[PDB]
Write a protein that binds this ligand. Sequence first.
Ligand code: CU
Length: 99
Amino acid sequence: IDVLLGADDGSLAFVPSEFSISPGEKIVFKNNAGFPHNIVFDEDSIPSGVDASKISMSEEDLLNAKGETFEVALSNKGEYSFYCSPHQGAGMVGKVTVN
Ligand SMILES: [Cu+2]
């Protein structure tokens, strides 16, 4: 599934921000608008036993040009909360469910 970082009107959101996937399906996050942007998974808000480090950017790593992507695949089922560290306060957050 593709997820935009930044809406086409420059809003600071994931598009889509809530979605479901199958195990091992890829998520491609692509730098769209209002960068820099990143994707960090919340260690306290993903399935038990998952290593967030494995599926996130570092807090300090950024995508700062149009069309940069980060790709990840999830396999454990459950809900995964994620956010953009620099724009978390702006409401740039999301949640994916692996079902
Ligand atoms: Cu962002």
